[PDB]
Write a protein that binds this ligand. Structure first.
Ligand SMILES: [Mg+2]
Ligand SMILES: [Mg+2]
Lengths: 231, 222, 244, 233, 235, 204, 195, 219, 240
């Protein structure tokens, strides 16, 4: 109200309204699902078009051979944060000959987002990220909020109507976690999860974006006729 | 005073065929009169069907190759996974090298691959990023021993048609990968005999439309 | 953060005026009247000290008339402290020019420099402008005797006669009435004092309430002399012109 | 640019069937003065890596602190710091190699020759060299300074190529190392009789041996050597 | 007052949303992508008859293979064009090749959100970036001050956009010829323009693989306008 | 190569009874080649006289610098700078270039306008003050000037006697220096009159 | 090494400049003009280190041309010479000093007097009736010291210069490939047609 | 040295038909012949040619850069850059780097209707000179043309090409560091035209036989 | 440093500081540009509220940027000096690097670029100035007339006016200026420029300044009497 003019101001109840408004930009964003087994981690994203002449806005960004994320909210903010992850993944490889742990990637994103919430002049990031990766401790899924809060999960969803996909995954938890050494079945579970967040529109060939990373699978994005198999 | 440069010896050879390219190097690493390693690889697969060697000061060579490999990774990120053509790689490596024009990478760089018409390509660089597309280039210690031989046995220089008394040059024939590898092996065998820094092993990376494959041959260990 | 407290000293009004320049000009309108009159054979600077005291040391006092170099003087209307900052900058500019070209700075070049500094404070920096209007009296071998004025906007103009500070409307009408082009310094001295004597908000114009200066080629042959009048010399010229 | 002041001589190392051995004498020389004898130049990093350092001792003590800080840093927000996300030899080497090449590239080197000996997560032997120039190389045997000239020839008679590594036991490897340290004591003027030896085995882990001495030395033949040519007495 | 980088309670940046209003007041620009090339057309909208219309430059070359049309505060576009030209040429210097149209557009869009308390405000101009590269053929992009860029088979920006876009929705198909696209841009420009469309108040351009980016002569456009009038009178 | 002996030239200053004298040669050269015979090395800021020997570009630069500084001084102080105060200003100004100095041998001469006391001072190139009662010497013939002054000088000379002494000191010193001569100027300075005399001398 | 001579006569200033550009034993040009017009009544000739001479000369030209436009006035040759000297004097204690020697020939329209300024690379300035930079200096000085009269006409000054160049051609080891001559008077700056 | 340097055989001359540019193709590190097939003519753009003498890298890198700066000028000003302007971009750039150890002696050749056929010689010293003819033979730059100084302004394009080719042959024979092949370029208002690669080995015997020259050499 | 964003967007997509800068221009004395067949004429209003003015030394309204290009303006006089100085520096910088004087279009594009920069840089306000930039490109006889405004947009004009009552004199020019036949001579062009100002000025005395720019750096400012003869002839033809 009087306390939402900048990110440096607490409200009388100890809330940061600029951060809460940034969090709102994510809810307006198109739905994206993350889920993993013990062998593979999968991103599924519903891409959003401007109109019938326009392309569908790309949602999934590759960060390294073993790590990448899906975005919901301000796409340029995802580009800045994903670029930062690309550099941190790259620094780890060049200096230490070491693939960056997904958990440490989460800690780095948290700390970068935090600095924008405690300084004058800046603004919070207006995007939410689902980071998947396969490192030395197996498959990982992270959820990033521009508050700085990063959370390790078996599955989740962010964006408009994400609650439908999240409830489904909460039911299926015991089933999809056990889908080991079967990439196609894990993606099916992700496509079935994101389907709980659709209204009026359905998954078409230029609508659906899928990414997968796993034990002997580099981070690869599937778009166009490569996802027709799953429609 | 402190000298930031050294000589790790070694010799490299790039030959461009009609529809293939080979980049070969000895696997010996030396300082002065000592052998550091008999097998320290010098020729690297950088991705996008490009093989690279930066011969001379091994530290500068490792640094340049590392930076170029990283350049390929970021080219993919920045340009929607577009394949880096050998000519674009060559121009990129010039900028990497010329960036240190006043404190150079003390290396002779050769890259091999296929051009955009699928024909064999070799690019040769000086330490400060001067570069040329070539069919044949030896670099390193035994370069002066190898290049005259290649001039004669690849380009058929100073060879004429018998009975023409030098009026008809010996006609240039397209060399197969098998004949080029014979010339590479004989080049290094000869260099190993006459150059004290050359020996131990020969690693050849062959580039075709099918990708990069690796052949290794032992050299004399004296 | 800090934005809350920013007055924004360098913004246009909806009418396309610079608030702080307009308010600075309001400030200057309350400052003691300064008059410059340019004659064929020299320039007169006359200025009124603001409601003085009997205990003020007048002979060592300077609030109105300042020397920039041997050829150029200024009359001040506004904040004296603000004027001294600019005066010291102008004195350095004159010596910089003299060092570079081995020639005394032409009057306009000095005026344009000081005016450009004032301008800068109205367009960037977020600082208040200088609450100062200058009358520049100067001589160079290009244009001869010159009168200029500059105001907090950093606008400057040339004049045959001009007033700054209090009652400029009244002062300018009186100058416009009695000024002629063939006028001489001695006549200009009389005009300047007669104008102040009629426009002053004080009961009577006395020596202790005036600063006076003349720039004359009344220097022996082909050179120019600046004369900052002493209290006794101002008292004498007041009697001579028949005001006291 | 500087000059080394207090210096350590040869570090020697080799691969055997199940791991790596590395050794270095306990001397810090001050030019021709053998000033410090209780100097440890093998610095273990966890239970899988030993870093053997020759050259400037002040620079070695700096590198020792970097490695100590590396272990602390790795443990930060790392629940698997003592498991899957523990420091590997390869990580510790690549870090040192980065620092060494950067320091030479600012014309302010760390005046050292470093051998990183260890065993990787998958049980693979790790043995790689880096020096003040940022030059790096791997071999079944590695040695710095005099060790390169005198130890390598002896160690290469045991493991001459990669295929000899599975045929080399820890007893034969250690024996060859200990013999090489005796030869270096005979022929190196900046060497010492007291040395440390570290074994990193993929089964028995890190065994660190301190206060080892060169023994079984041959001197008796000296008594028969008289004069420099003609002298018979 | 309030931060320049402030979010609204709906999770939108005030200044970005406000710049989008400035672009709505801009003169109309239309792009149509075909397999034979991309056409770019603009309404010049001279404020007076004494203004020499050929000096109105709302269609601009970035490189031989990339053209650009603008709508909104067109002065804001100059530094964006400068960056685009520098990015295109710099990439050619570093890589001895043409830069991908998407990579050029992405480079321009990276400037967009570089504002705060960097430039004091977002750009008040939208760009239609049209070009050809070997990888993705003929392409049309819409670069917004939000830093978002959409690819379009056809797109209209400026005052007459929502009317023009609805018209492009009906008219565009994947088999359009370059000639058909030219007439289509002229037709929709003529529909949404206040003044009557002629060769002096409207400007055409195209990008083909063979000839690269070309701004059409007034004589060449005049013929296409006459061709349009006759074919509309033909039924 | 030595910056202080490229262009050549000398300055000498002497005190007399209620007067000071400062004198200089007129030569400017490029080593062996004489270039100008009109290169005066004595300048004045009000009643304070400054002679400068050494690198000619620095002589010209320091003159312009002290004109600049004494002009500002006068505007602010509302009075002409005095010899004692100027000496400190020359010292300060030279020492601020301690590690990149002007290659000059400055000499100050003048009468304090209030006390009437004759004043002279010399400086090394980094501003160390030599405040001699008798005489100050500077330039490529400083050894010759020291010799001449030490024998010719006596205290409390009348202005017209001091003129002869300083003139004979300069002329005979300059004639034993390759890089000095080509004419000479002498300033006889009294409390409120200064006479300037150009001397006839050999032109080789 | 190069030849730049200046002579100031009664009513004008004449500058004669060697046409040769030589780097080592290589002759790069034989038609080189070592002059820039600073203002309509001011001419500067320059000799010295390669690149620096033209870079300095052109930089001065731009600055004097800038002053001309701003004040709609032509700076006096004295003022231009003082500006040029100061720029040279900055260079000597700079990171990489300009090695440029110049002659400034100008006609002062206020005083109706020709003026010649000699400034060396250190910013050493003198006003002379005649001046020269380089090896040719000492010879020409002795000749000009004998022949020069201050009431000389432009044609008399030209004849005297022509004698200098003739004598310099004979006595100099290098070939300077002739001179360009330019006259600076009240009417402006003109290149002597034949010399 | 480590850096490939070229001190020999670059020729550029102005004539009735535009500019002829002739270079050799030999690269030498000391007495070692590194290559017989290097390009000593840099194609800045279709209308601008640069000759490589001095540092091979220094010439390649900064004349490729000059083509980039020329392209920007044409986008911004919608006009071909003048040879005077293009040459001064490069000359002003190397002058910034002066004393750092750049080595470059280059002839910038272009034909515009404003200027006509124009050659500028640009130096790492910061020298920029306009001239009718420039040649570089064993680290020495000359404005006279290797053979007869006069040659002809009124010279056929065929004849002018031959003179340039024959001039490189004269240098290639006598100069140890000059050889390999001759590369010929003809610069017109509408752009430059490549006139091919001629091996000096085959050229020498043919010229000797046809001209009757090189009597001293036995063949 | 002072970084405050003074030029920002309002909810209706307007930049008020840029629009308020245009109000400063509206308050400025009238300036008019008319290009003939072989000339351009810059006419400027001098408000007669200031008499006792020294016209010898008072800043003239038309400024030479180079020997071939002139700049007149409407709005804040102090603001105009900063644009004039930058333009004059750029004109010499262009001659130094390109070895050719600026084209009128290039000089306009630079000045307009400076104006634009000051509308999205922190801690600065826009220039309260619009400019008329007239002259001839080197070795070209085609007349050039451009207009710039605080936003930084610029364009070419057959004839244009800026400042107070510019609406009225533009009205005049729009009915009196034929494009097919521009003022063929200097006389005709000056006459049409004086006529256009007489719609707004008041007295045709010292209130009208005229500067004629012809090809090949031929720029001259008309005197009081020369302009007074145009003023006399115009009204004597009007009495009919
Ligand atoms: Mg061998
Ligand atoms: Mg003498």
């Amino acid at each position: 109200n009087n306390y939402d003019g900048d990110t440096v101001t607490f409200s009388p109840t100890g809330r940061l309204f600029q951060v809460e408004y940034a969090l709102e930009a994510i809810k307006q964003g198109s739905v994206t699902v993350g889920l993993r087994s013990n062998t593979h981690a999968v991103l599924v994203a519903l891409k959003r078009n401007a109109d019938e002449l326009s392309s569908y806005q790309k949602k999934i960004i590759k960060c390294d051979e073993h790590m990448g994320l899906s975005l919901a909210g301000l796409a340029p903010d995802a580009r800045v944060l994903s670029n930062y992850l690309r550099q941190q993944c790259n620094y780890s490889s060049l200096v230490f000959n070491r693939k960056l742990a997904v958990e440490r990637a989460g800690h780095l994103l948290c700390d970068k987002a935090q600095k924008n919430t405690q300084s004058y002049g800046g603004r919070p990031y207006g995007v939410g990220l689902l980071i998947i990766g396969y490192d030395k401790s197996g498959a990982h899924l992270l959820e990033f909020q521009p508050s700085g809060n990063v959370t390790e999960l078996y599955g989740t969803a962010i964006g408009a109507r994400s609650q439908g996909a999240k409830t489904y995954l909460e039911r299926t938890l015991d089933t999809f976690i056990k889908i080991d050494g079967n990439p196609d079945e894990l993606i099916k579970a992700g496509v079935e999860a994101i389907s709980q967040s659709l209204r009026d529109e359905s998954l078409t060939v230029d609508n659906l974006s899928i990414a997968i990373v796993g034990k002997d699978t580099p981070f690869t994005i599937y778009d166009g006729e490569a996802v027709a198999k799953y429609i | 005073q402190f000298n930031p440069y050294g000589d790790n010896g070694g010799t490299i050879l790039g030959i461009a065929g009609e529809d293939f390219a080979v980049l070969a190097g000895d696997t010996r690493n030396i300082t002065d009169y000592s052998i550091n390693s008999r097998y320290e690889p010098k020729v690297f697969d950088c991705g996008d069907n490009i093989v690279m060697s930066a011969n001379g000061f091994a530290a500068d060579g490792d640094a340049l190759v590392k930076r170029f490999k990283n350049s390929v990774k970021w080219y993919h990120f920045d340009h929607n996974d577009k394949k880096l053509s050998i000519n674009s790689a060559a121009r990129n490596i010039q900028h990497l090298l010329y960036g240190k024009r006043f404190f150079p990478y003390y290396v002779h760089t050769i890259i091999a691959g296929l051009d955009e018409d699928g024909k064999g390509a070799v690019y040769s660089f000086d330490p400060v990023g001067s570069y040329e597309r070539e069919q044949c280039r030896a670099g390193g210690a035994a370069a002066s021993l190898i290049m005259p031989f290649l001039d004669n046995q690849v380009n058929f220089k100073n060879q004429y048609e018998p009975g023409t008394n030098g009026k008809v040059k010996k006609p240039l024939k397209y060399l197969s990968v098998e004949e080029v590898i014979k010339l590479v092996r004989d080049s290094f065998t000869s260099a190993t005999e006459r150059h004290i820094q050359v020996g131990d092993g020969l690693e050849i990376l062959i580039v075709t439309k099918d990708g990069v494959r690796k052949e290794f041959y032992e050299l004399k260990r004296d | 953060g800090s934005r809350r407290y920013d007055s924004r000293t360098t913004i246009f009004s909806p009418e396309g005026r610079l608030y702080q320049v307009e308010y600075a000009l309001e400030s200057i309108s309350h400052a003691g009247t300064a008059i410059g009159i340019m004659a064929s054979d020299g320039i007169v600077l006359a200025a009124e000290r603001k409601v003085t005291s009997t205990l003020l040391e007048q002979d060592t006092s300077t609030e109105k008339l300042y020397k920039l170099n041997d050829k150029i003087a200024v009359a001040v209307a506004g904040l004296t402290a603000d004027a001294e900052i600019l005066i010291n900058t102008a004195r350095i500019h004159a010596q910089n020019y003299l060092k570079t070209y081995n020639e005394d700075i032409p009057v306009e070049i000095l005026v344009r420099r000081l005016s450009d500094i004032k301008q800068g404070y109205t367009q960037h920096g977020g600082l208040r402008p200088f609450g100062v209007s200058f009358i520049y009296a100067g001589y160079d071998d290009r244009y001869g005797y010159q009168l200029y004025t500059s105001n907090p906007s950093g606008n400057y103009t040339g004049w045959k006669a001009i007033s700054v500070g209090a009652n400029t409307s009244a002062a300018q009408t009186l100058l416009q009435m009695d000024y002629k082009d063939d006028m001489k310094v001695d006549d200009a001295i009389e005009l300047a004092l007669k104008t102040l004597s009629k426009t002053t908000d004080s009961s009577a114009l006395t020596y202790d309430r005036l600063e006076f200066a003349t720039i004359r080629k009344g220097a022996n042959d082909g050179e120019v002399y600046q004369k900052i009048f002493k209290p006794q010399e101002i008292k004498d010229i007041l009697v001579k012109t028949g005001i006291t | 640019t500087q000059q080394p002041i207090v210096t350590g001589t040869s570090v020697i190392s080799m691969k055997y069937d199940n791991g790596v051995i590395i050794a270095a004498d306990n001397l810090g020389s001050y030019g021709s003065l053998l000033r410090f004898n209780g100097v440890e130049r093998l610095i273990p990093v966890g239970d899988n890596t030993v870093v053997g350092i020759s050259g400037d001792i002040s620079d070695m003590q700096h590198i020792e602190r970097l490695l100590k800080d590396l272990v602390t840093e790795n443990a930060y927000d790392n629940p698997l710091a003592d498991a899957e996300e523990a420091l590997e030899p390869s990580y510790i080497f690549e870090y040192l190699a980065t620092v060494m090449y950067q320091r030479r590239s600012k014309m302010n080197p760390l005046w050292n020759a470093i051998i990183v000996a260890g065993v990787q997560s998958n049980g693979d032997q790790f043995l790689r060299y880096v020096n003040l120039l940022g030059v790096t190389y791997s071999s079944p045997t590695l040695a710095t300074g005099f060790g390169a000239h005198m130890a390598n020839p002896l160690l290469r008679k045991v493991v001459d190529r990669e295929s000899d590594i599975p045929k080399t036991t820890v007893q034969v490897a250690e024996e060859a190392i200990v013999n090489a340290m005796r030869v270096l004591y005979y022929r190196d003027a900046r060497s010492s009789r007291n040395f440390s030896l570290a074994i990193i085995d993929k089964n028995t882990g890190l065994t660190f041996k301190k206060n080892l001495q060169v023994e079984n030395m041959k001197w008796d033949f000296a008594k028969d050597i008289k004069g420099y040519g003609t002298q018979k007495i | 007052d309030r931060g320049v980088s402030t979010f609204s309670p709906e999770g939108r940046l005030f200044q970005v949303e406000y710049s989008l209003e400035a672009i709505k007041l801009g003169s109309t620009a239309i792009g149509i992508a075909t397999k034979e090339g991309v056409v770019l057309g603009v309404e010049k909208r001279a404020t007076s008859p004494l203004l020499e219309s050929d000096s109105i430059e709302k269609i601009v070359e970035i490189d031989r293979h990339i053209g650009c049309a603008m709508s909104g505060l067109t002065a804001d576009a100059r530094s964006m064009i400068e960056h685009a030209r520098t990015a295109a040429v710099t990439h050619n210097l570093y890589y001895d090749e043409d830069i991908n149209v998407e990579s050029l557009t992405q480079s321009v869009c990276d400037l967009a959100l570089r504002f705060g308390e960097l430039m004091s405000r977002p750009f008040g101009v939208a760009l239609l970036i049209a070009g050809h590269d070997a990888d993705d053929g003929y392409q049309l992009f819409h670069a917004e001050p939000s830093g978002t860029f959409y690819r379009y088979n056809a797109k209209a920006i400026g005052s007459g956009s929502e009317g023009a876009q609805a018209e492009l929705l009906n008219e565009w198909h994947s088999s359009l010829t370059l000639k058909e696209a030219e007439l289509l841009v002229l037709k929709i420009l003529k529909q949404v323009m206040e003044e009557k469309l002629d060769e002096n108040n409207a400007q055409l351009s195209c990008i083909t693989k063979q000839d690269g980016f070309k701004i059409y002569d007034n004589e060449k456009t005049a013929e296409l306008i006459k061709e349009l009038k006759e074919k509309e009178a033909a039924e | 190569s030595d910056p202080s002996s490229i262009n050549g030239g000398i300055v000498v200053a002497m005190t007399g009874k209620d007067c000071v004298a400062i004198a200089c040669d007129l030569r400017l050269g490029s080593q062996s080649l004489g270039v100008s015979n009109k290169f005066e090395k004595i300048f004045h800021y009000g009643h304070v006289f400054l002679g400068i020997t050494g690198l000619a570009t620095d002589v010209t630069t320091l003159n312009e610098m002290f004109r600049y500084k004494t002009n500002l001084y006068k505007l602010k102080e509302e009075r002409a700078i005095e010899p004692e105060t100027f000496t400190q200003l020359v010292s300060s100004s030279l020492y601020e270039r301690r590690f990149g100095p002007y290659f000059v041998g400055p000499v100050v001469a003048g009468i304090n306008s209030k006390s009437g006391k004759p004043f002279i001072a010399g400086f090394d190139l980094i501003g160390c003050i030599d405040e001699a009662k008798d005489f100050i010497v500077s330039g490529t013939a400083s050894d010759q000037l020291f010799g001449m002054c030490e024998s010719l000088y006596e205290p409390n000379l009348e202005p017209e006697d001091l003129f002869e002494t300083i003139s004979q000191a300069l002329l005979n010193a300059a004639d034993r220096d390759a890089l000095s001569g080509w004419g000479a100027v002498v300033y006889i300075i009294k409390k409120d009159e200064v006479v300037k005399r150009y001397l006839k001398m050999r032109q080789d | 090494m190069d030849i730049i001579l200046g002579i100031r006569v009664q009513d004008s200033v004449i500058l004669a400049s060697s046409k040769a550009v030589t780097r080592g034993i290589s002759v790069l040009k034989d038609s080189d003009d070592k002059t820039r017009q600073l203002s309509p009544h001011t001419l500067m000739s320059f000799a010295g280190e390669a690149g620096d001479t033209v870079q300095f000369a052109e930089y001065i030209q731009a600055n004097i041309q800038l002053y001309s436009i701003r004040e709609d006035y032509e700076l006096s040759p004295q003022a231009v010479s003082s500006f040029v000297r100061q720029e040279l004097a900055k260079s000597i204690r700079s990171r990489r000093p300009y090695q440029v020697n110049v002659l400034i020939g100008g006609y002062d329209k206020k005083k109706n007097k020709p003026e010649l300024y000699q400034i060396d690379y250190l910013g050493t300035k003198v006003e002379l009736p005649y001046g020269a930079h380089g090896y040719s200096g000492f010879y020409t000085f002795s000749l000009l010291d004998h022949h020069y009269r201050p009431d000389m006409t432009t044609e008399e000054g030209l004849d005297l210069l022509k004698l200098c160049v003739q004598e310099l051609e004979k006595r100099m080891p290098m070939d300077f490939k002739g001179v360009i001559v330019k006259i600076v008077d009240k009417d402006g700056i003109r290149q002597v047609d034949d010399f | 040295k480590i850096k490939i340097a070229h001190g020999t055989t670059t020729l550029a001359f102005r004539f009735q038909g535009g500019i002829i540019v002739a270079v050799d193709s030999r690269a030498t590190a000391g007495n070692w012949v590194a290559s017989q097939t290097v390009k000593k003519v840099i194609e800045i753009n279709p209308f601008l040619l640069g000759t490589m003498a001095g540092g091979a890298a220094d010439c390649q890198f900064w004349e490729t850069w000059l083509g980039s700066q020329c392209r920007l000028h044409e986008l911004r000003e919608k006009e071909r850059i003048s040879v005077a302007a293009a040459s001064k971009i490069l000359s002003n750039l190397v002058y910034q780097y002066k004393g750092a150890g750049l080595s470059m002696g280059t002839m910038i050749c272009g034909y515009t209707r404003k200027e006509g056929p124009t050659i500028y010689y640009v130096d790492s010293d910061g020298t920029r000179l306009k001239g009718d003819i420039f040649c570089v033979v064993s680290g020495q730059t000359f404005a006279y043309g290797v053979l007869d100084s006069n040659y002809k302004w009124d010279l056929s394009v065929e004849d002018a090409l031959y003179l340039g080719k024959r001039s490189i042959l004269a240098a290639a024979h006598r100069d140890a560091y000059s050889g390999g092949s001759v590369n010929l370029y003809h610069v017109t208002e509408d752009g430059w035209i490549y006139h091919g690669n001629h091996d000096v080995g085959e050229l020498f015997w043919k010229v000797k036989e046809e001209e009757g020259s090189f009597n001293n050499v036995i063949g | 440093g002072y970084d405050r964003a003074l030029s920002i967007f309002s909810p209706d997509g307007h930049i008020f500081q840029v629009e308020y800068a245009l109000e400063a221009v509206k308050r400025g004395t009238c300036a008019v540009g008319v290009k003939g067949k072989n000339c351009v004429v810059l006419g400027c209003e001098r408000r007669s509220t200031l008499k006792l003015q020294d016209t010898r030394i008072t800043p003239s309204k038309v400024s030479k940027i180079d020997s071939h290009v002139v700049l007149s303006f409407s709005g804040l006089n102090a603001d105009s000096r900063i644009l004039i100085e930058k333009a004059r520096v750029e004109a010499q910088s262009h001659r130094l690097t390109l070895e050719d004087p600026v084209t009128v279009e290039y000089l306009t594009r630079y000045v307009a670029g400076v104006q634009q920069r000051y509308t999205q840089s922190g801690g600065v306000r826009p220039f309260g100035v619009s400019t008329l930039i007239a002259g001839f490109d080197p070795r070209d006889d085609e007349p050039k007339l451009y207009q710039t405004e605080p936003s930084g947009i610029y364009s070419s004009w057959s004839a244009q006016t800026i400042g107070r009552n510019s609406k009225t004199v533009r009205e005049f020019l729009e009915k009196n200026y034929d494009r097919k036949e521009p003022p063929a001579t200097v006389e005709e062009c000056v006459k049409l420029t004086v006529r256009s100002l007489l719609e707004v000025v008041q007295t045709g005395a010292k209130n009208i300044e005229i500067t004629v720019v012809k090809p090949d750096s031929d720029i001259v400012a008309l005197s009081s009497e020369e302009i007074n003869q145009y003023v006399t002839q115009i009204e004597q033809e009007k009495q009919e």
